[PDB]
Design a protein around this ligand. Structure first.
Ligand code: NAG
Ligand code: NAG
Ligand code: NAG
Ligand code: NAG
Ligand code: NAG
Ligand code: NAG
Ligand code: NAG
Ligand code: NAG
Ligand code: NAG
Ligand code: NAG
Ligand code: NAG
Ligand code: NAG
Lengths: 160, 321, 321, 160, 321, 160
């Protein structure tokens, strides 16, 4: 959404590409195929793994509410002990609901930014040797066989 | 020839919510909230808990005739009590500072019961006559087994002067009681003396109980009342008693043998012949997850509790229908 | 020919704050914090609250001569009491476990007062002599109207033995008291007997009050003191009394007729002949909004409270000056 | 701010365009006019409506603090009952102040991203048929009458 | 010719954490969490605190012979007490509602001690015989200096009838006690009368203490016990006493002279001949920072506390290795 | 990360440029030098200063937990007083840890966006008078002496 790539200038996802989160579809004389970008995928995996574990780990620990006994003439302090645990456990209910909502929104934007930066990785790589088609594809002005195609993925095409 | 950049799709049905939008389908998602439990009470760390079943903490400590199962219990992991135990104070009455005691026994993991005043050492009173139909055992009148309801001997109740000195290394829970009768006739019939008292003292204790004679509503047949009291007696301290009547003497006290983290839990569950790490009143938790919504109050290696139906993080990306 | 992309502007003056910058002007904004209230006490859900006005809960229940307005009140929605009610205990003294009782009456919504010991049934004592100048009614010495200050008859105060058995389906709030006189002469003058007591018992109650004779500072002219006590009497339980003096007997008790959510509120406000959903001590809230800063403590369908001057979300975008 | 469009490569807002949040100004032989982009405006309206309602709805409910009575010799537990409500209601005072600040910052960035993606919607639509002027305008290399102009707004210009 | 856009780098080693990544090196960073403190107890706002040292609040107020340093203290800023003060109740016993009193003295900043019943005004009893070996002063038997242990004179203890009327403008803390002896012989030896009492009354007080005669464990040589009681006496109210024995009479009371924010702190620290703004039990804080992790409980202009090792904001940008 | 400039199409930072956070390296016949962009640097300084002070100032104040005394037979309410302060001070421990993590991530992205918008400031300024090299540099098609170079920094090159 925020970065315009996913469900934007890239219209849809590839069901056919299963080996990673972001990657390439190539098409040439030898054929057409899907292939993941390892680095970009593994960057995101790391990040999102650490986002998750940060939400879990930094809870060390929340309120640990073990029960008490009040009697028939201590109804005020029973109510007090009651209200305390209401208030607390309802504070964490707000935190957790909202945390998850906010980070769910960021995680999608994180992915959108990733697909955008991957696109721009290749744009800068190919310079004037291909035309941008505006749907996420580049059409080469020259023959690009599989060795050429893999060299784009390696980051090694026109290494200078 | 052509190279396209693009992203993963699959046939994932998993939806999550964001601030801006809800029910967004994604390629992967991680559930953090636990909702499952085996539904049984289980040993904590491989050690069985103290499940009182139909007895209460009072019933157990005083030795209600119906709690014989727990005459000499082993070391426990945590205390389970039913919502309304049927075997509490068989003889009607009250237990002084009951909740504070209950709270004390939460942080204990083993008692050892010792005799401190032999029942057979009451050479000037009658010690084996204090039974009641309010406290039956096998259709026979009985009484709390750890305390002694003393009675006059030969129309005389001489003034009791006794003590126990805590020569042990551990603290000692000591229990005694006072009998509040229904009228003056009964007072004479049981204790001879019309005007009686019970004085109890330690380094820190200093009390003088006076029984209260009155007609009141019958409970398990009794208009009389038993009122029970306790104290922790410190190593090398002594407890002194003096009474000319109405004294429910101790015989057994409790040596605090093992201390540690636990508390009393209200649950209607039985034992599960099972073993666990974490426990709620409704059931035990076995998992790796870090949050739950099952029950507020808990003990064990328990991931944190919250009141919510569903917590689910997006991990993958927006899936394309 | 030309096409330009661009965004909305208007003449909005509304500023909001962000983390990076403050007082940013925007095209639209939504205020979430409520700050208004009609400034009156209003019926909850179309039912009038219990506004004690110048009486306290004690004054009302005991029947202070100045609280006649509340002799037989209808069902209430919530209890309002002033900061320092002038009509409390007209005869000086104390009310035992007052706060616990106050807390009990928060969760009740209707009493029915019943006679349990007729005033005219005290055939061996005097029942109509117990009035005091501390408790005037229309310039005339009087007393709490729901309890009876008994006095000796013919230089004799025989031992009272009475009871009431709760044959009703509802719980019963029962109130009695004990008179602590100023010296021995007074004790003889009112009760004959020098050494007196009051024993009270139910299934769970077991007390024996002893009055206390002493000189103390005069309050509303009195060095004596009245001390009041209460209990909830369960359906089918009985309450027993016994006294040879100083007994402030009950006549009326309260049948708990309607229970429900409410509590006691401290407010100096009057009734507003009005109707509402939500209430604070300062005023009632009528709106759709979801937050406020008026007052901490509240009852009704009340949007949540917080301590802040201004909460305002941006909805539109940065407006161009 | 974050996305460079509002108060960036688009210098200012249009007072004249009142029917929506984001939109178009056109200029041709038949005249010049303002017109909103319905889709883009309504996307944002939905989003921002749901952001608001999420802050309101997920508060279900905060601490519901109904008063208690303590007496002259229960000053410790009165203080305890006091401090509890201080601590709580001052926790929500932090949440709410900061939530509003953080989401106010995101909402402005949300709008900035929206105006950017709208710009790029049209850029990709017009391809080489117009020149970018860098101030948010495109100058057509051919005549673009009102039917043409409306076809840009529909997303139907050069539909292929 | 060429123009490049770019960003700052330096040789900063400072790392911070984010949600996505941890230990990210940055060009600048700001630490918000305070961790330092001078390690001493210091005057608050230029005024010395009340450091009791080896005495307790009880020891100080009652006037334990070993607390002479604090016979007439000046105005204080806050109260410091050790974990287990050695000089507490030299004569064994208890202090009634001690914690509530301790809590009262937290919000006070100056007493003035006044004589209310001269020791030399006890013309019908002995006032200078009440000393004990439990309470030595310079190897000599003594007693709490602010109260008076009265004894019989000429085999007679007439009934005490005394009072003090608070003619001052300030509230008055008044302290008295009752002696619980070890047996009847002692009771006769000290007070003559076998059956004794102590009645105390104000506008709001109404008590009648009865001593309790019993054998109990010896503490500092004594099987007897002293039990102490207090009240706040309001301007223009009077306190009345009556006793035929066991009365530990007041001589001195405390006029509440200065009120204000403070509380009792448990610390083993001495004074630092120093001056500060903020204070923890471990040490005083001097800084501009807005958070710390030193100690929960605090008094003064103290930045907020939290339980964490490290809190550090990024201010600069990712530094390039 | 999110905006692709820092550690992206700009590979690294300049140790040599010390007068500001973002800026310029120029190279011409008269020489080559580093120079800060004042406006861009001072925008960010303001922002980040206010982000910091917002986290500090809006804490007014957290829970102010001053101790109480309970005795041997008030162990329940001591535990209650205990648990209250556990729960609270452990709520702020979650807030503060996570706040700092989230805002640390935004602050880096804020800086990334800033370097990107600076790049685009100059791109739009220079229009067709220089070629983008894709590493954050522009090569002029004409001589650009120091007066010319400073005019780029002022925002005054080709003022029209
Ligand atoms: C009981 O006391 C009586 C006094 O009447 C005495 O004579 C008698 O021997 C005693 N009885 C027994 C069984 O020891
Ligand atoms: C009260 O009265 C009923 C008879 O109506 C009786 O069965 C019940 O036992 C009485 N309650 C008590 C406590 O005596
Ligand atoms: C009161 O008691 C007296 C005893 O002196 C008795 O003679 C008298 O008849 C009684 N008085 C009344 C009015 O019943
Ligand atoms: C205390 O003394 C004053 C006279 O100075 C008197 O008016 C007041 O009533 C006295 N207080 C009491 C409780 O007797
Ligand atoms: C003490 O009382 C006695 C009574 O035996 C009396 O005669 C004597 O004079 C009194 N002693 C003193 C010292 O006043
Ligand atoms: C208990 O017994 C020991 C002797 O074993 C003695 O030294 C100690 O003082 C006694 N405790 C008391 C309170 O008398
Ligand atoms: C990537 O592909 C190139 C060109 O096909 C191949 O020769 C080489 O093995 C690969 N290089 C790297 C660094 O992965
Ligand atoms: C999500 O909300 C939608 C629309 O508001 C509703 O139909 C549905 O109940 C929710 N999702 C699921 C799986 O129930
Ligand atoms: C916002 O802050 C500004 C500058 O700090 C100040 O002048 C003003 O009081 C605030 N806005 C309003 C409307 O008061
Ligand atoms: C939009 O505009 C076109 C061209 O002017 C017009 O013919 C048509 O009615 C519209 N189409 C849609 C799908 O709105
Ligand atoms: C940050 O974490 C790293 C890797 O997880 C660890 O080596 C290190 O202890 C941490 N940083 C510092 C300065 O200790
Ligand atoms: C900036 O540089 C120009 C061109 O070198 C110079 O003439 C002028 O003094 C500066 N202008 C401004 C507005 O800073």
């Amino acid at each position: 959404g925020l970065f315009g790539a996913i469900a934007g200038f890239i219209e849809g996802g590839w069901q056919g590409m299963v080996d990673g989160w972001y990657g390439y579809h190539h098409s040439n004389e030898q054929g057409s195929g899907y292939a993941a970008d390892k680095e970009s995928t593994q960057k995101a995996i790391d990040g999102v793994t650490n986002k998750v574990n940060s939400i879990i780990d930094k809870m060390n620990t929340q309120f640990e509410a073990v029960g008490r006994e009040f009697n028939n003439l201590e109804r005020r302090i029973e109510n007090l002990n009651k209200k305390m645990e209401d208030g607390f456990l309802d504070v964490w209910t707000y935190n957790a609901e909202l945390l998850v909502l906010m980070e769910n929104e960021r995680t999608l934007d994180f992915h959108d930014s990733n697909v955008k930066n991957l696109y721009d990785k290749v744009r800068l790589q190919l310079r004037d040797n291909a035309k941008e088609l505006g749907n996420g594809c580049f059409e080469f002005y020259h023959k690009c066989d599989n060795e050429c195609m893999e060299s784009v993925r390696n980051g090694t095409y026109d290494y200078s | 020839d052509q190279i396209c950049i693009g992203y993963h799709a699959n046939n994932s049905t998993e939806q999550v919510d964001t601030i801006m939008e809800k029910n967004v389908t994604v390629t992967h998602a991680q559930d953090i909230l636990e909702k499952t439990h085996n539904g049984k009470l289980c040993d904590l760390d491989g050690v069985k808990p103290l499940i009182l079943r139909d007895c209460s903490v009072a019933g157990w400590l005083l030795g209600n005739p119906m709690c014989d199962e727990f005459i000499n219990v082993p070391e426990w992991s945590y205390i389970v009590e039913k919502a309304n135990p049927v075997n509490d104070l068989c003889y009607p009455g009250d237990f002084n500072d009951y909740e504070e005691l209950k709270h004390l026994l939460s942080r204990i993991n083993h008692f050892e019961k010792i005799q401190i005043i032999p029942k057979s050492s009451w050479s000037s009173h009658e010690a084996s006559l204090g039974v009641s139909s309010a406290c039956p055992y096998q259709r026979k009148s009985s009484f709390f087994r750890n305390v002694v309801w003393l009675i006059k001997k030969n129309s005389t109740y001489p003034t009791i002067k006794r003590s126990y000195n805590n020569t042990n290394q551990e603290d000692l829970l000591v229990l005694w009681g006072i009998h509040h009768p229904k009228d003056a006739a009964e007072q004479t019939k049981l204790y001879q003396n019309p005007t009686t008292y019970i004085s109890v003292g330690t380094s820190t204790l200093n009390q003088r109980l006076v029984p209260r004679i009155a007609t009141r509503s019958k409970v398990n047949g009794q208009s009389g009342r038993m009122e029970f009291f306790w104290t922790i007696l410190k190593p090398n301290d002594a407890i002194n008693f003096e009474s000319n009547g109405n004294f429910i003497a101790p015989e057994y006290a409790y040596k605090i043998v093992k201390k540690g983290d636990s508390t009393i839990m209200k649950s209607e569950l039985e034992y599960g012949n099972c073993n666990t790490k974490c426990q709620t009143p409704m059931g035990a938790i076995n998992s790796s997850m870090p949050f739950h919504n099952i029950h507020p109050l808990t003990i064990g290696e328990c991931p944190k509790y919250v009141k919510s139906n569903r917590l689910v993080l997006a991990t993958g990306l927006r899936n394309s229908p």
